[PDB]
Amino acid sequence: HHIEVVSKQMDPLLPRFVGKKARKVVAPTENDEVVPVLHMGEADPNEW
Amino acid sequence: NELHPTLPTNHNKTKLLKSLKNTKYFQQTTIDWVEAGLQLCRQGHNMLN
Amino acid sequence: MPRIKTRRSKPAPDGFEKIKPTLTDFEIQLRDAQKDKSSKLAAKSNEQLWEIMQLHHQRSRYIYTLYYKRKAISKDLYDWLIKEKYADKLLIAKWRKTGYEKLCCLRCIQKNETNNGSTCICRVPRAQLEEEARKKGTQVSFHQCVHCGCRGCASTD
Amino acid sequence: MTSWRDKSAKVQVKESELPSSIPAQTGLTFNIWYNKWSQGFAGNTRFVSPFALQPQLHSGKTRGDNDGQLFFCLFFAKGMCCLGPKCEYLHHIPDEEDIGKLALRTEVLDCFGREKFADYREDMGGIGSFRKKNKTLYVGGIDGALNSKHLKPAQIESRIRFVFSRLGDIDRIRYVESKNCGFVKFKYQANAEFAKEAMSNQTLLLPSDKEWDDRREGTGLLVKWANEDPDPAAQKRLQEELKLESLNMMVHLINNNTNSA
Amino acid sequence: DEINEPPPNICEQCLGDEANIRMTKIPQGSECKICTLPFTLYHFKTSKRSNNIIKTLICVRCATQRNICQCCMLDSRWHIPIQLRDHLISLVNEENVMTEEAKNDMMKRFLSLKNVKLGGAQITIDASIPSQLLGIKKWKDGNSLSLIVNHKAKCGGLRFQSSETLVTPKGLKRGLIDRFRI
RNA sequence: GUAUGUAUUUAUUUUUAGAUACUAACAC
RNA sequence: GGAGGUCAACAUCAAGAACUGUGGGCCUUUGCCUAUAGAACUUAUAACGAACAUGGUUCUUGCCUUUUACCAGAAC
Ligand SMILES: [Mg+2]
Ligand SMILES: [Zn+2]
Ligand SMILES: [Zn+2]
Ligand SMILES: [Zn+2]
Ligand SMILES: [Zn+2]
Ligand SMILES: [Zn+2]
Ligand SMILES: [Zn+2]
């Protein structure tokens, strides 16, 4: 069917972006893989 | 006003109305002035209400 | 220059009185058009407007027939009318053009306003819309130009 | 055909007759933006419709027919439409053919051309969901009959049957004696929508019986969307229906899938 | 950028038989019927002259996750309601693949943002004792019809007509207990 | 001469004296 | 084809006292030197406007409980 895409001129008075409305969202954190966290006391506590 | 000039804005060539009249939504006519004053008062009053 | 009888306005030319009653019947109707007869429905509202546009058309058509057809009035009476806003200069000028003799308005030929392309289906001859209708056999869905109330400005119909 | 097809639709209500906007004095002062009332809260605002339809009497051809519009005039469903044959939308009770035309677009939106929402509504309100095809209307506030008490529930049952019966092809109806509710079920989603918008806020009994001329003081009957059926019987019945229909469309899947190869 | 870049998803069905189509693109339209977040909207008309107008309801994301059509909200391939295709699939295997959806708000508003792709998507006067549409249909073709009554709790009820009812008496009984009501 | 907060469901979803007292936009 | 329009679009309007094109020579296109043609509008008690408003940041003050609203000078 093809297509042709065309913008519509807004009535300048009416709000442009009819749906832009401040709302807050919690995004998920999508973890695909794990990043290995790779690193290399006794009397010490008496000091610390 | 003589001491501190302003030196206006080229590219200002775009005006509110020249942009406004372009659209479908504004139409042009003549009218008596007092009538435009009265209309504008009713306009305003509806806006603030 | 204004519709009003403001002191600057030059008095009427000679042939005026004969046609004054015919014009007054238009004026007294426009009074009744803008009286704000209330309606709930959209269709009814823009119908109310269609009244005004059509009345304006009829008046300017009356004068145009007087000067440019019958030549029943003088040039000076005419120009004095146009300067007093009894007629629409631009609209008449479209009527004098070849293709536009029956035209609605000056909106209907606006190329810019309409979304794609131009020129209301208000300008397309019934002869054709019946044909594209014939291909579908759905008859034809068109009745009134939303700006005007026209049905077939096009000068064949 | 002889009834509806030929006879063009007749204006239900003159435009001057239509109710005014600005419903009356639910509060102290009127409000322009939202159309409601300002301060204080008057006793809850609901009222019986001054109007109703008359399926064979009113319904007739209109402009949508020639223009091939899909969707039905709701002001007709309320019998309040003032545009008569000039109306843009169809005036007549939905049949199987026209639902045949809507069938592609009946998924997202009702027969009146209004988008459905996802979750229904707290109280099972106006329009349904596009998740679940729900053909079952809850009839409630049966005191739309006003205060007349009746010889039996066959009064209520019978009367309702004769009400909705006009509006479309009914698969079943059950009135409940204990808690006042009818549950009415149709062949088609479309008829359910149409009937819901048609019979909301309505009255009962005869064009004249007893208190009839005072009918307009009543509250009017809720027609809402109905929940599932908790009893095991109809639950079996649904489960089976879903089964056999799933089976039925598997035929399509394998026919066009077979064409896919 | 993020919202525009994915192109729309439209069925071939509802998009009509026209060769070339003009569709409008509004960069912030209504929110989804589902996720309740803004997106980019598309008009179009099947026919050039068709009065009816098609408006994509859901997101691109909220669609792609469910693998459906934005105008139809039917499955992208089989043209099936979502609540069905997952039942067919659920018939194979045993019990699964139901699409669990998002009450509250930022449950859903949250949910649309993950890349999960969804459970469903991954695979892709005569008294007669012992519905009403069937009875009225069969009795409708053989004679005059006025009203029917059945109370399924009682499994029996009236059939009333306005002679022709005796024409019905040929096939009515035992098909079914049918007698002449009082 | 208290912000502020909580609740406001009506319309029927299938099986004998007084002391110690507390406090009071009430009287310097 | 001429006159216009309270019509539009696109160019251009603050700088070595200042623009552009072209011919020729050197370096190796830029750039320098030489030759030639045309330069609308705006500029010397300096500028598109013989007119004259507001805002932001930063300092200095002034009112002076604090913030908006402000006092009156400067620079950007
Ligand atoms: Mg403080
Ligand atoms: Zn016109
Ligand atoms: Zn037109
Ligand atoms: Zn026309
Ligand atoms: Zn109607
Ligand atoms: Zn979404
Ligand atoms: Zn589709």
UniProtKB/Swiss-Prot annotation, chain B:
The listed locations are:
Nucleus
- Enumerate the transmembrane spans: none
Annotated signal sequence range: none
What else the UniProt entry mentions is: Present with 468 molecules/cell in log phase SD medium.
- Subunit architecture: Component of the U4/U6-U5 tri-snRNP complex composed of the U4, U6 and U5 snRNAs and at least PRP3, PRP4, PRP6, PRP8, PRP18, PRP31, PRP38, SNU13, SNU23, SNU66, SNU114, SPP381, SMB1, SMD1, SMD2, SMD3, SMX2, SMX3, LSM2, LSM3, LSM4, LSM5, LSM6, LSM7, LSM8, BRR2 and DIB1.
UniProt comment concerning the protein's domains: The MPN (JAB/Mov34) domain has structural similarity with deubiquitinating enzymes, but lacks the residues that would bind the catalytic metal ion.
Tell me the function of this protein. Functions as a scaffold that mediates the ordered assembly of spliceosomal proteins and snRNAs. Required for association of BRR2 with the spliceosomal U5 snRNP, and the subsequent assembly of the U4/U6-U5 tri-snRNP complex. Functions as a scaffold that positions spliceosomal U2, U5 and U6 snRNAs at splice sites on pre-mRNA substrates, so that splicing can occur. Interacts with both the 5' and the 3' splice site, as well as the branch region. Has a role in branch site-3' splice site selection. Associates with the branch site-3' splice 3'-exon region. Also has a role in cell cycle.
* Record protein name field: Pre-mRNA-splicing factor 8
What organism, scientifically named, is this protein from? Answer: Saccharomyces cerevisiae (strain ATCC 204508 / S288c)
Provide the gene name from the record.
Answer: PRP8
UniProtKB/Swiss-Prot annotation, chain C:
The protein's superkingdom reads Eukaryota
Question: Where is it located?
Answer: Nucleus
Keywords from UniProt, A to Z, are: mRNA processing, mRNA splicing, Nucleus
Where along the sequence does the record place the motif called Nuclear localization signal? 2-11
Instruction: State the InterPro entries in the record.
Output: BUD31, BUD31/G10-rel_CS
Entry GO terms, CC:
nucleus; Prp19 complex; spliceosomal complex; U2 snRNP
Which GO BP annotation is one of this protein's?
Answer: cellular bud site selection
Its assembly, as annotated, is: Belongs to the CWC complex (or CEF1-associated complex), a spliceosome sub-complex reminiscent of a late-stage spliceosome composed of the U2, U5 and U6 snRNAs and at least BUD13, BUD31, BRR2, CDC40, CEF1, CLF1, CUS1, CWC2, CWC15, CWC21, CWC22, CWC23, CWC24, CWC25, CWC27, ECM2, HSH155, IST3, ISY1, LEA1, MSL1, NTC20, PRP8, PRP9, PRP11, PRP19, PRP21, PRP22, PRP45, PRP46, SLU7, SMB1, SMD1, SMD2, SMD3, SMX2, SMX3, SNT309, SNU114, SPP2, SYF1, SYF2, RSE1 and YJU2.
Q: What else is known?
A: Present with 1900 molecules/cell in log phase SD medium.
Family, per entry: Belongs to the BUD31 (G10) family.
Describe the task this protein carries out: Involved in pre-mRNA splicing. Important for bud site selection.
The name of this protein is Pre-mRNA-splicing factor BUD31
Source organism per UniProt: Saccharomyces cerevisiae (strain ATCC 204508 / S288c)
From Swiss-Prot, chain D:
Q: Report the locations given in the UniProt record.
A: Nucleus
Is the DNA damage keyword given for this protein? Answer: no
Q: Name one GO biological process term.
A: spliceosomal snRNP assembly
Zinc finger region(s), C3H1-type: 67-94
Q: What's the superkingdom here? A: Eukaryota
The segment(s) forming the RRM domain are: 135-228
Q: Which GO terms describe its cellular component?
A: Prp19 complex; U2-type catalytic step 1 spliceosome; U2-type catalytic step 2 spliceosome
Q: What GO MF annotations does this protein's record show?
A: pre-mRNA binding; U6 snRNA binding; zinc ion binding
Similarity comment: family membership: Belongs to the RRM CWC2 family.
Q: Domain text from the record? A: The C-terminal RRM domain and the zinc finger motif are necessary for RNA-binding.
Q: Tell me more from the record.
A: Present with 2650 molecules/cell in log phase SD medium.
Subunit note? Belongs to the CWC complex (or CEF1-associated complex), a spliceosome subcomplex composed of the U2, U5 and U6 snRNAs and at least BUD13, BUD31, BRR2, CDC40, CEF1, CLF1, CUS1, CWC2, CWC15, CWC21, CWC22, CWC23, CWC24, CWC25, CWC27, ECM2, HSH155, IST3, ISY1, LEA1, MSL1, NTC20, PRP8, PRP9, PRP11, PRP19, PRP21, PRP22, PRP45, PRP46, SLU7, SMB1, SMD1, SMD2, SMD3, SMX2, SMX3, SNT309, SNU114, SPP2, SYF1, SYF2, RSE1 and YJU2. Interacts with ISY1. Interacts with PRP19.
This chain belongs to which protein, by name? Pre-mRNA-splicing factor CWC2
Source organism of the structure: Saccharomyces cerevisiae (strain ATCC 204508 / S288c) (Baker's yeast)
Q: Which gene encodes it?
A: CWC2
Swiss-Prot record, chain E:
- Keyword Nucleus applies: yes
**Signal sequence span per UniProt?**
none
Location in the cell:
Nucleus
> What biological-process GO terms show up in the record?
mRNA splicing, via spliceosome
Output a single Gene Ontology CC term carried by this record.
Answer: U2-type catalytic step 1 spliceosome
The source's superkingdom equals Eukaryota
Q: Which GO terms describe its molecular function?
A: pre-mRNA binding; U6 snRNA binding
Q: Write the record's keywords in alphabetical order, separated by commas.
A: mRNA processing, mRNA splicing, Nucleus, RNA-binding, Spliceosome
- Tell me which family the UniProt entry assigns to this protein: Belongs to the SLT11 family.
User: How does this polypeptide assemble, per the annotation?
Assistant: Belongs to the CWC complex (or CEF1-associated complex), a spliceosome subcomplex composed of the U2, U5 and U6 snRNAs and at least BUD13, BUD31, BRR2, CDC40, CEF1, CLF1, CUS1, CWC2, CWC15, CWC21, CWC22, CWC23, CWC24, CWC25, CWC27, ECM2, HSH155, IST3, ISY1, LEA1, MSL1, NTC20, PRP8, PRP9, PRP11, PRP19, PRP21, PRP22, PRP45, PRP46, SLU7, SMB1, SMD1, SMD2, SMD3, SMX2, SMX3, SNT309, SNU114, SPP2, SYF1, SYF2, RSE1 and YJU2. Interacts with SLU7.
What does the protein in this record do?
Involved in pre-mRNA splicing. Facilitates the cooperative formation of U2/U6 helix II in association with stem II in the spliceosome. Binds to RNA.
**Can you name this protein?**
Pre-mRNA-splicing factor SLT11
**Lineage of the species this protein comes from:** Eukaryota, Fungi, Dikarya, Ascomycota, Saccharomycotina
Whichever gene encodes this chain, its name is ECM2
Tell me the part of the parent protein that is shown.
3 to 288 of 364
